[PDB]
């Protein structure tokens, strides 16, 4: 009998990730593992373990010069000829929180429980977050030496 | 070779460095510039400008001879300010001052006015000759390039706005 | 500085101007109005002004909506709508309780009139979108007013979204742009507006000043 977690054993906490010079790939990966609870030894792929992630300073994320011009974001409305495209560089002016949040939500598994995982994610643009009623501890990026 | 040659400073009363920055001030207005990050700017014995670099890369040799002739434009542009000199050719074409502005009669059905921006002062010397002055070399030559394109280049009668001394190309016509 | 008023369409008639031309006007009773609420940007997020219009008995208005008038000191009206202003300098000329009348528009000014278009019921495709139909003779079996084809074949195996078809028509918010104001009658509270004004004879009409001029 291996461990399968009960309901009421998953204890959640609150992290906050600054993004002042962090690239979009390193930060979306480290937020995807931290929301799902891969860093916890009581992991189970069918249980929404994992903590809250507050991403502040998303307008200062590290995107290269050739990606604010040539990397496109596509939406389609369903109507014919309804394909629209916006560059990253004209999304980092209006909605910079959507660029970080889209990179996280493509790295979660494509299933039903990821729609409950993504309810634990708050992405903001400035250096100020409203969740000071809780006590978010900061989370810096670490790589385990080998 | 350019960049491996110091910057002669006639007056330069506050040629300073504050954390990868530079400034200049003198008989004219002040000017600012920020050198690219590998290139260091430093002093000679005379308090002048001598720039240095790490050695022998494709990208550090380029930013060194660039950033020499951008700092020396500041200490020239404050002492000896830049004046471009332009002329008007063609019969009936002329130029006047409407205050600080500069009107042209270039054969159109409306007088073309050119609003002079900050730091730029216009002055005519003749109905077919005028000058554009200032302290920044890029900002002067940008205004003088807007005036050069006011008409289409005409290779048949030579009617247009020119720089003085330049020779445009000419065709035979009919 | 976009001015606006609420009103009731009263029908159409014709009138003669100084050059002896005939001008089809549409009478709009730009009735007396009142403010009752001011949307400020620091409180509500935008800049607008409510406008209350129409006589009503004070027993026909329920207790949740009656109290919204008691906070402004105004007797209850029938209609209630907002005039959207620009995003700055909100209400330096609108106060709560201010009486707006019809003579805020001048003779010869332009207005944009928005109301609800008349209903046409469940309308077929020749009335709603203006198709052509098949012919009236030469063999045409039972297809004299039918829409014809609605798609391709096995590629694409779907009707595209947005295909024009039969359905209901009317009851749409329709704005008519750049209508000339022939005469404002301050004695009667009536604008004479040149042209057509959407609605049945008695519906609610918002008369705003034009932006296209």
């Amino acid at each position: 009998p291996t461990y399968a977690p009960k309901a009421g054993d998953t204890t959640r906490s609150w992290y906050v990730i600054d993004a002042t010079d962090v690239v979009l790939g390193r930060l979306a990966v480290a937020a995807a593992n931290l929301l799902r609870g891969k860093h916890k030894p009581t992991f189970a792929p069918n249980v929404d373990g994992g903590d809250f992630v507050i991403v502040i300073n998303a307008d200062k994320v590290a995107i290269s010069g050739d990606k604010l011009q040539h990397k496109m974001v596509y939406r389609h409305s369903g109507y014919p000829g309804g394909l629209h495209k916006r560059t990253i560089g004209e999304l980092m002016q209006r909605h910079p929180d959507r660029v970080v949040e889209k990179a996280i939500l493509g790295m979660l598994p494509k299933n039903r429980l990821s729609r409950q995982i993504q309810r634990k994610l708050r992405v903001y643009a400035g250096p100020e977050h409203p969740h000071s009623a809780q006590q978010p501890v900061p989370y810096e990026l670490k790589q385990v030496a080998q | 070779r350019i960049g491996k040659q110091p910057i002669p400073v006639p007056a330069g009363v506050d040629v300073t460095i504050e954390g990868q920055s530079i400034s200049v001030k003198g008989p004219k207005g002040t000017l600012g510039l920020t050198v690219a990050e590998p290139i260091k700017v430093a002093r000679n014995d005379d308090g002048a400008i001598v720039v240095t670099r790490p050695d022998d890369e494709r990208r550090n040799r380029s930013l060194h001879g660039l950033s020499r002739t951008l700092v020396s434009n500041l200490v020239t542009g404050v002492t000896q300010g830049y004046t471009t000199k332009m002329e008007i050719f063609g019969v009936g074409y002329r130029v006047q001052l409407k205050g600080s502005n500069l009107e042209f009669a270039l054969g159109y059905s409306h007088p073309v006015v050119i609003e002079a921006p900050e730091g730029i002062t216009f002055a005519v010397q003749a109905p077919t000759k005028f000058t554009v002055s200032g302290i920044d070399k890029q900002k002067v030559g940008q205004i003088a390039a807007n005036i050069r394109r006011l008409r289409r280049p005409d290779p048949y009668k030579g009617k247009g706005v020119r720089y003085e001394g330049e020779q445009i190309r000419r065709k035979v016509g009919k | 500085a976009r001015k606006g008023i609420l009103g009731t369409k009263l029908g159409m008639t014709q009138v003669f101007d100084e050059s002896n031309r005939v001008v089809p006007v549409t009478v709009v009773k730009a009735g007396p109005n009142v403010v009752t609420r001011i949307r400020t940007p620091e409180r509500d997020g935008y800049s607008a002004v409510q406008l209350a219009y129409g006589e009503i008995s004070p027993r026909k208005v329920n207790k949740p909506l009656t109290g919204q008038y008691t906070a402004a000191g105004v007797n209850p009206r029938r209609y209630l709508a907002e005039l959207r202003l620009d995003d700055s300098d909100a209400a330096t000329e609108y106060q709560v309780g201010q009486e707006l009348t019809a003579e805020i528009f001048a003779d010869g000014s332009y207005v944009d009139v928005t109301g609800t278009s008349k209903g046409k019921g469940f309308a077929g495709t020749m009335k709603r979108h203006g198709f052509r139909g098949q012919g009236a003779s030469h063999g045409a079996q039972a297809v004299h007013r039918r829409p014809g084809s609605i798609g391709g074949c096995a590629t694409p195996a779907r009707v595209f979204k947005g295909t024009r078809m039969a359905g209901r028509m009317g009851n749409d918010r329709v704005t008519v742009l750049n209508l000339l104001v022939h005469k404002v009658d301050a004695e009667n509270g009536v604008l004479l507006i040149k042209g057509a004004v959407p609605g049945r004879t008695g519906g609610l009409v918002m008369v705003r000043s034009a932006i296209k001029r």
Binding site: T2, Y3, H39, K40, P41, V144, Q146 | - | -
Partner: protein, 60 residues
């Protein structure tokens, strides 16, 4: 791999160090100590780390 990284070592080098020290505990029980007894898992990390070769990138 989640519990080795609470003790600054990858899973890559924990399995190497537990074969270089002669600890034949299977991965079922090694993952049941990590949930039920965490202080008895730090000791198996310090056994596997000390038994690991000093330059892990140098050839044998």
């Amino acid at each position: 791999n989640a519990a080795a990284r609470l003790n600054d070592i990858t899973y890559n080098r924990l399995i190497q160090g537990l074969k270089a020290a002669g600890v034949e505990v299977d991965r079922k029980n090694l993952a049941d100590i990590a949930i039920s007894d965490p202080a008895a898992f730090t000791a198996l990390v310090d056994v596997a780390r000390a038994a690991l070769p000093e330059d892990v990138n140098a050839p044998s």
